[PDB]
Each structure stands twice: as structure tokens, then as C-alpha cells.
Amino acid sequence: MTYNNVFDHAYEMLKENIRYDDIRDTDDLHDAIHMAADNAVPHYYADIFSVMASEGIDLEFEDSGLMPDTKDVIRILQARIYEQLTIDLWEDAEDLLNEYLEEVE
Amino acid sequence: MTYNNVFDHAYEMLKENIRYDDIRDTDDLHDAIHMAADNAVPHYYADIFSVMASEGIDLEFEDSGLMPDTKDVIRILQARIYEQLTIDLWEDAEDLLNEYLEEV
Amino acid sequence: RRRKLPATIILRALNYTTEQILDLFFEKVIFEIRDNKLQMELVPERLRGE
């Protein structure tokens, strides 16, 4: 019902995708992070409104190229949640790779 | 915020407008219902998405003529919440029009 | 009694620039840059309980 739970789910999925593939390069971080952001959104209809209801997400857009052309509001809200999750994962991926490199020896 | 508190504030502003205007007719009640649903709107975006997340609301609506055609999402959501508030304040002000006349 | 809006819309309807919004509406303070001095002007003794 809050954004913190879905943020923790995306955090756990990104940690699992770092641990499974063992990626040490910063340029080849495309497919794992994009599939983690695609698999972090909920499939239910009310959960999208529940994520949009809590704090941590706004109405102002960063990139206008990610806006689909449809008459459905729920797809636009899913794209906005996907955009906010990509912002959070691409801002936390460097710190999680630093923690993954400092975890093992 | 929840749906119940926003609806309570909605018919609270409606009954304040009725006490200010002294409206007796139902045809004059309906314009007050439209003006009260025009009033009492939240400016917090989180409360607006919390009305859409709470119970007592559906995704599909009956009328599509009131649905605007623009790239603004908040205008479409405000029009949908405005239509829902007009319907709900009519349904729960049909009794309030008799209650106000029976108070004083 | 209709949909309300913040008063900066009607305030800026008199050809009232945002520079004039952030200058005239509030008493400001100044600061110097570009010289690595990191200094301000004299205090206006405006602080009472902060």
C-alpha cells in the first residue's frame, strides 16, 4: 500500500540480479536492471493506485519520450511507476555494486 | 486521506453553502451540488491519488462526454473525481434537502 | 465559490514578473561570489527567536 514496500522488492530483486550474474562492469548494466524494473511493478489494478497514493512519486516528468499513446489512465500510471523505479534503481545501482565489491574479499 | 473524510468534507461544504444560500428547491439544490463538488478539492497530489486508491470508486465510468482529451493526467483524474462527487453528493443530498428543511 | 487557485496567478496577471515576485514580496539578503570570499552584508537584527 506504500512505495517503500515495492522499493524494498525492487531492492531485493536488484541485489539478486547482481549476485546471480556477478557483473563488475558499469556499461553492461542494461538488461538486468531493466528486467528488474520491469518485474518490480505489480500486476493488480488497485496496487498501482496504492503505489501512486503514497509519497516518493510526483507528477512532474523527467523525459517526455517514455509517454505511451493510449486512452487508458492505468497504463500511464504504470509507466510513471516504472519511470520512478528506473530512477531509483539507476541511482542506487552504483552504491549496490560498491557494496557487492566490498562484501566479498 | 481516505474517501470517507473527503466525502464528509464535501457534504460539509455543501451544507454550509445551503445554510449560506437558503436553498429550498431541488433544481436549485443541483446547482449547489455542482458548485460544492467544484469546491472542497484537495491540492495535495498524494491525497488525489489516495482518493483513487481508496474504496468506493471504479475505473470504468458511465459517461464519456465529461472525460477530457488532453495529455494532462491530473485534469482527467479531476474530472472523474468531480463526476463521482456530483453523483455521490446528489445521492446523499436528496435526503439532506429534506433534513435541512426539517431542522429549521 | 468555484475551484480555487493560488494567488500568484492573479498577482502575475498585472504584468508582474517573477523577478518582481521574488524581490518585492519579501525582504531579502545578499551574498558575494566569484572571489572565494564567502561574505555577506551587515546584519539587519531580524532574528528574535530562531
Looking up residue B31, the CATH number of its domain turns out to be 1.20.120.780
C3, C5, C8: which to substitute to probe chain B, counting the most B Cβ within 10 Å? Answer: C3
Q: Is C6 helix (H, G, I), strand (E, B) or coil?
A: coil
Nearest CA in chain C to B20: C1
Q: Mapped to the 3 state alphabet, what secondary structure does chain B carry?
A: CCHHHHHHHHHHHHHHHHHHHCCCCHHHHHHHHHHHHHCCCCCCHHHHHHHHHCCCCCCCCCCCCCCCCCCCHHHHHHHHHHHHHHHHHHHCCCCHHHHHHHHC
CB contact under 8 A, B35 and C3: no
Domain that holds residue A77: 1-105
Q: How many CB atoms lie within 10 A of CB B50?
A: 20
Displacement of CA B102 from its chain's centroid (Å): 23
Give the orientation angle of helix A3-21 with respect to helix A73-103, to 10 degrees. Answer: 50
Q: Which of B100, B2, B95 is nearest to B46 (CA)?
A: B2
Q: In whole angstroms, what is the distance from residue B16 CA to residue B33 CA?
A: 11
Instruction: With CB atoms and an 8 Å threshold, state whether B53 touches A53.
Output: yes
Is B35 within 8 Å of chain C by CB?
yes
Do residue C2 and residue B39 have CB atoms under 8 angstroms apart?
A: yes
- Largest Cα separation within chain A, whole Å, is 52
Neighbours of A32 (CB within 10 A): 19
Report the amino acid identity of residue B82: Y
Please answer whether residues A55 and B55 qualify as being in contact, where contact means their C-beta atoms are separated by less than 8 angstroms.
Answer: no
Cβ distance B52 to A50 less than 8 Å, yes or no, reads: no
E strand or H helix at C20, and its extent? helix C18-24
C-alpha cell belonging to residue B93: 443530498
In angstroms, the first-to-last Cα distance of chain C is 38
Q: Do C and A have ≥3 inter-chain CB pairs under 8 A?
A: no
The answer to whether residues B47 and A56 touch, using CB atoms and an 8 Å cutoff, is: no
CB of A95 within 8 Å of a chain B CB? The answer is no
Separation of alpha carbons B33 and B17, rounded Å: 9
Interface contact B38, partner C, CB < 8 A: yes
Per the CB < 8 A criterion, the answer to whether A92 and A14 are in contact is yes
Element (DSSP H or E) covering residue A95: helix A73-103
Extended strands (E) in chain A: none
- Reading the block at residue A72, the C-alpha cell is 487508458
B17 touches B35 (CB < 8 A): yes
* Radius of gyration, CA atoms only, chain A: 15
Specify the number of domains making up chain A. 1
Q: Which three-class secondary structure state does DSSP give residue A96?
A: helix
> In whole angstroms, what is the distance from residue B33 CA to residue B10 CA?
9
Q: A33 with A89: CB under 8 angstroms?
A: yes
CA–CA gap between residue C30 and residue C19 (Å, rounded) = 15
The one-letter amino acid at C41: E
Residues of B in contact with A47 (CB under 8 A): none
> Scanning every residue of chain A, which has its alpha carbon at the shortest distance from the alpha carbon of B49?
A53
C35 grid coordinates: 572571489
CA distances from B84 to B104, C35, C46 (A): 30, 60, 50
C-beta atoms surrounding A72 within 10 Å? 10
Structural biology method used: cryo-EM
The CA radius of gyration of chain B, in Å to the nearest whole number, is 14
